């Protein structure tokens, strides 16, 4: 069934599962033509496939060549997503394949179910949570590898850096969702918060700065402030 | 013109013969139905006055034998029977007619309704789907379940309709996932019409059979089957032009015959709105769309 607040700790048990977010697969800029009509120009996208227990991120880069000569691209993008997720699962050893795949948008349910007919024991699930994974392209190193790609490519990351050495996966997911929620509500402010201090650096093999435990508490508090704030500047409260 | 004789009518019952129905009072002198048109399958069906639960009945073709109805006080229902003694059966029927104890199948000369509802329904094909092979006629009731329900439980007392499942490996060619799910022509034309049914006549036959079971007995599994077979055609971009023209006539007469007060239960808003207004065939069912819009505009 659907994943929600009630069954939230199921994400951190020992059944392998993946979140799949398709919101950055088909990306366009809208512009005017010389004749004054409107047209789209596609830019590179990505599938965001994430193990919430381990932090392993399978980032499949979607190069704009995949759209050449195709019609109904928003519909195709969902099926392309399902094709790539199915290919990923088939590439994993049996003991690494997920028992469940949770899609962040319900329109991915039928495309993924059909592509996974060969895997009747893998549950395809929606969610009632409004997760902020669309903001993945606000993470500078992820955006950089997507925009530089000249061909289809899969790149592997750990979106938790080394956090699991010090915190649990429940706590790591909560920090991730807070950071991504902030970047989604006000990207400039969020990024200022994260980088304001030039003495805290991002290691070459990491995505986020190397905050101490105490500095993470300060950071997380500032992100909460921002989200409520902008929730003020938005609704005037 | 053939005859279905009754031993007697011991319990009060609403009897139905094809699209007609009449009431027989408890111990009313009644000996059957005469003047039944030869050349069509027929269904004789029953609803007891005391328990409107369980409509039940019998599909039969008078060309295949001499059938009579006998009420069984142990099993509590009217049972169809075969009398192999033709000489004795003919003598009984003649005796009943002379006594004017048979209701007349009341067909209007102008009226092609029953033909139009049963054009491709075949009895031998019906027997293939209800395997009580010892009898030439087939029993159906409101409660019988289909194999699709069985997957989710008595295999002998079930309707084995052809299984249709749009999210199945039979329906979806490896590597054509999007193509085959959004345009079901492969599944309609290759899998079902060329590989299972053999021709469209058989496809229409099972579709007509599923509707009539859904309508006369409120068989949920029959209603599901009827809607599934319509949707498979409407969801195919490539359908033989003669098939679409015939489907429009088939559905027209089914909608025309449907009791107005049962539409809420026997019509599925999603299938019909998709078929008439979104599907590939949204412009190909003119007669069906006209009668649906004039008779059931609420559903849409
Ligand atoms: O065996 C039968 N028993 C019931 C018939 N019956 C009623 C009055 N005298 C006999 C049967 C066989 C052929 C035709 C038929 F109407 C019924
Ligand atoms: O229809 C006749 N018998 C069939 C019985 N029946 C049951 C329900 N409606 C009719 C019939 C008509 C008039 C007089 C008569 F002796 C017989
Ligand atoms: O051809 C039919 N079903 C396809 C499966 N089948 C059954 C027997 N041989 C193949 C069929 C079923 C019921 C009524 C009807 F007129 C046709
Ligand atoms: O309307 C029907 N089902 C959908 C609503 N419903 C009712 C009970 N369970 C679900 C329906 C029920 C029985 C026979 C039939 F042909 C249709």
Query: How far is Cα of residue A30 from the mean position of the Cα atoms in its chain?
Result: 23
Q: Which domain holds residue B222?
A: 116-299
Q: Let me know the angle formed at the C-alpha of B177 by B162 and B152, rounded to the nearest 5 degrees.
A: 40
Q: Is A3 among the domain residues? A: no
Residue B53 CA to residue B217 CA, distance in Å, equals: 10
Give contacts of B187 with chain A, Cβ < 8 Å.
none
How far apart are the CA of B235 and the nearest CA of chain A, in angstroms? 16
Q: Residue A183's CB: how many other CB atoms inside 10 A?
A: 24
How far, in Å, is the centroid of ligand 2 from the Cα of B16?
15
> What values do phi and psi take at B75, rounded to 5?
-85, -10
Tokens, residue A108: 């991915």
Tokens, residue A133: 């994974």
Q: Is A151 among the domain residues? A: yes
Contact A114 B169 (CB under 8 A): no
Q: Is A4 among the domain residues? A: no
Domain containing A79 — which CATH number?
3.30.420.230
Contact B172 A110 (CB under 8 A): no
Q: Which residue, of A129, A146, A163, is where some domain finishes?
A: A163
Contact A79 B168 (CB under 8 A): no
How far, in Å, is the centroid of ligand 3 from the Cα of B107?
28
| CA Rg value for chain B | 21
- What is the structure's resolution, reported in angstroms to one decimal? 1.5
Among chain B residues, CA nearest to A120: B168
If asked whether residues A32 and A80 sit together in one domain, one would say: yes
Instruction: Return the residue whose CA atom lies nearest to atom 14 of ligand 2.
Output: B100
Residue B158 CA to residue B221 CA, distance in Å, equals: 10
Contact B177 A83 (CB under 8 A): yes
CB of A179 closer than 8 Å to CB of A161: no
Contact B177 A118 (CB under 8 A): no
Cβ-count burial of B264 within 10 angstroms (0-12 exposed, 13-18 middle, 19+ buried)? exposed
Q: Are strands B103-104 and B42-48 parallel, antiparallel or unpaired?
A: unpaired
User: Buried b vs exposed e over B210-227: b needs ≥16 C-beta within 10 Å?
Assistant: bbbbbbbbbbbbbbbbbb
For residue A155, CA distances in Å to A33, A47, A137, B15 come to: 35, 11, 14, 72
Residue B143 CA to residue B157 CA, distance in Å, equals: 10
Tell me the residues of B at the A interface, defined by beta carbons under 8 Å apart.
167-169, 172, 177-178, 181
Tokens, residue B221: 């599994």
Which DSSP string corresponds to chain B? Answer: -EEEEBS---S-EEEEETTEEEEE-TT----EEEEEPTTS-EEEEEEESS--S--EEEEE-GGG--EEEEEETTTTEEEEEE---HHHHHHHHHHHHHTT-SEEP---TT--HHHHHHTT--HHHHHHHS--TT-SSEEEETT--BHHHHH---GGGSB-PPP--SSSTTTS-TT-HHHHHH-THIIIIIIIIIIIISSHHHHHHHHHHHHHHHHHH--HHHHHHHHHHHHHHHT-S---HHHHHHHHHHHHHHHHHS-GGGHHHH--HHHHHHHHHTSTTTTS-HHHHHHHHHH-TTT-
Best CA proximity match to B240, nearest among B277, B278, B206, B190? B190
Residue A40, SS3 per DSSP: strand
Residue B46 CA to residue A147 CA, distance in Å, equals: 72
Q: Which residue, of A129, A163, A197, is where some domain finishes?
A: A163
CB of A223 closer than 8 Å to CB of A179: yes
CB of B119 closer than 8 Å to CB of B204: yes
If asked whether residues A17 and A95 sit together in one domain, one would say: yes
Q: Is A90 among the domain residues? A: yes
Tokens, residue A195: 């980088």
Q: Residue B37's CB: how many other CB atoms inside 10 A?
A: 14
Q: Let me know the angle formed at the C-alpha of B298 by B297 and B300, rounded to the nearest 5 degrees.
A: 70
How far, in Å, is the centroid of ligand 4 from the Cα of B116?
25
User: Which value, to the nearest 10 degrees, does the dihedral of the CA atoms of residues B149, B151, B155, B161 take?
Assistant: 60
If asked whether residues A121 and A87 sit together in one domain, one would say: yes
If asked whether residues A142 and A31 sit together in one domain, one would say: yes
Helices (H), ranges, chain A: 73-91, 109-115, 140-148, 169-185, 187-195, 213-235
Pick from B202, B205, B213, B228 the residue to mutate for probing ligand 3's pocket: most ligand atoms within 8 Å of its CB.
B202
Residue B42 CA to residue B36 CA, distance in Å, equals: 9
Residue corresponding to tokens 């009747």: A120
| Sheet containing strand A56-62, strands side by side | A123-125, A100-103, A17-21, A45-50, A56-62, A153-158
Q: Name the β-bridge partners of A59.
A: A48, A155
CB of B206 closer than 8 Å to CB of B162: yes
Best CA proximity match to B170, nearest among B194, B197, B192, B198? B192
Q: Is A31 among the domain residues? A: yes
Residue A67 CA to residue A43 CA, distance in Å, equals: 10
Q: Is A97 among the domain residues? A: yes
If asked whether residues A207 and A218 sit together in one domain, one would say: yes
Residue A228, SS3 per DSSP: helix
Q: Name the β-bridge partners of B8.
A: none
How many beta-carbon pairs below 8 A join chains A and B? 21
| Tally of domains in chain A | 2
CB of B218 closer than 8 Å to CB of B57: no
Residue A20, SS3 per DSSP: strand
Residue A30, SS3 per DSSP: strand
CB of B97 closer than 8 Å to CB of B34: yes
Best CA proximity match to A114, nearest among B172, B271, B256? B172
Q: Is A2 among the domain residues? A: no
Q: Is A107 among the domain residues? A: yes
User: Which value, to the nearest 10 degrees, does the dihedral of the CA atoms of residues A30, A31, A37, A40 take?
Assistant: -40
Domain containing A205 — which CATH number?
1.20.80.40
What's the DSSP call for residue A13? S
Give contacts of B168 with chain A, Cβ < 8 Å.
117
Q: Which residue, of A163, A198, A225, is where some domain finishes?
A: A163
> What values do phi and psi take at A231, rounded to 5?
-65, -20
Residue A103, SS3 per DSSP: strand
Best CA proximity match to B257, nearest among B204, B215, B210, B203? B215
Best CA proximity match to B267, nearest among B280, B278, B279, B254? B254
Domain containing B293 — which CATH number?
1.25.40.550
Q: Which domain holds residue A234?
A: 164-237
Instruction: Return the residue whose CA atom lies nearest to atom 12 of ligand 4.
Output: B220
Q: Residue B106's CB: how many other CB atoms inside 10 A?
A: 12
How far, in Å, is the centroid of ligand 3 from the Cα of B193?
11
Residue B36 CA to residue B34 CA, distance in Å, equals: 6
């Amino acid at each position: 069934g659907a994943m929600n607040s009630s069954n939230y700790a199921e994400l951190f048990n020992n059944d392998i599962k993946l979140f799949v977010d398709d919101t950055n697969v088909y990306r366009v800029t809208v512009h005017k033509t010389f004749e004054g009509n409107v047209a789209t120009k596609a830019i590179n996208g990505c599938i965001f496939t994430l193990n919430p227990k381990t932090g392993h991120l399978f980032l499949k880069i979607i190069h704009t060549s995949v759209w050449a000569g195709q019609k109904r691209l928003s519909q195709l993008a969902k099926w392309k997503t399902a094709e790539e997720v199915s290919a990923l699962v088939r590439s994993l050893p049996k003991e690494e394949q997920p028992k469940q795949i949770i899609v962040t948008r319900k329109a991915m349910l039928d495309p993924l179910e059909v592509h996974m007919l060969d895997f009747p024991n893998i549950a395809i699930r929606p969610t009632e949570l409004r997760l902020p994974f669309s903001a993945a392209m606000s993470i500078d190193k992820l955006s950089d590898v997507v925009m530089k790609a000249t061909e289809p490519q899969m790149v592997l990351f750990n979106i938790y850096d080394d956090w699991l050495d010090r915190i649990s996966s429940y706590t790591a997911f909560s920090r991730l969702t807070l950071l991504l929620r902030a970047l989604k509500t006000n990207e400039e402010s969020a990024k200022m918060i994260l980088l304001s201090d030039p003495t805290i650096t991002i290691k070459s093999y990491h995505l986020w700065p190397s905050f101490t435990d105490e500095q993470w508490i300060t950071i997380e508090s500032q992100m909460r402030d921002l989200i409520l704030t902008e929730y003020g500047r938005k609704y005037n409260v | 013109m053939n005859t279905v004789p009754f031993t007697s009518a011991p319990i009060e019952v609403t009897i139905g013969i094809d699209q007609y129905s009449f009431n027989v009072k408890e111990n009313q002198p009644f000996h059957g139905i005469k003047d039944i048109p030869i050349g069509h399958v027929h269904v004789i069906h029953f609803q007891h006055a005391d328990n409107s639960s369980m409509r039940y009945g019998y599909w039969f073709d008078c060309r295949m034998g001499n059938f009579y109805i006998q009420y069984d006080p142990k099993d509590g229902l009217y049972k169809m029977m075969e009398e192999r003694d033709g000489a004795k059966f003919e003598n009984i029927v003649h005796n009943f007619k002379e006594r004017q104890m048979m209701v007349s199948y009341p067909k209007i000369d102008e009226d092609d309704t029953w033909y139009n509802l049963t054009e491709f329904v075949q009895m031998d094909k019906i027997r293939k789907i209800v395997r009580k092979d010892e009898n030439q006629f087939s029993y159906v009731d409101s409660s019988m379940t289909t194999v699709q329900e069985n997957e989710l439980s008595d295999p002998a007392h079930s309707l084995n309709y052809t299984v249709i499942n749009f999210k199945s490996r039979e329906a979806i060619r490896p590597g054509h996932e999007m193509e085959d799910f959004l345009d079901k022509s492969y599944y309609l034309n290759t899998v079902m019409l060329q590989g299972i049914f053999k021709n469209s006549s058989n496809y229409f036959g099972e579709l007509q059979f599923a509707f009539l079971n859904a309508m006369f007995f409120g068989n949920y599994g029959s209603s599901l089957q009827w809607h599934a077979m319509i949707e498979l055609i409407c969801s195919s971009a490539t359908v033989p032009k003669h098939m679409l023209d015939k489907l429009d006539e088939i559905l027209y007469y089914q909608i025309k015959t449907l009791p107005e007060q049962y539409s809420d239960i026997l019509l599925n808003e999603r299938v019909w709105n998709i078929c008439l207004y979104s599907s590939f065939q949204k412009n190909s069912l003119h007669n069906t769309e006209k009668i649906m819009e004039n008779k059931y505009p609420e559903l849409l």
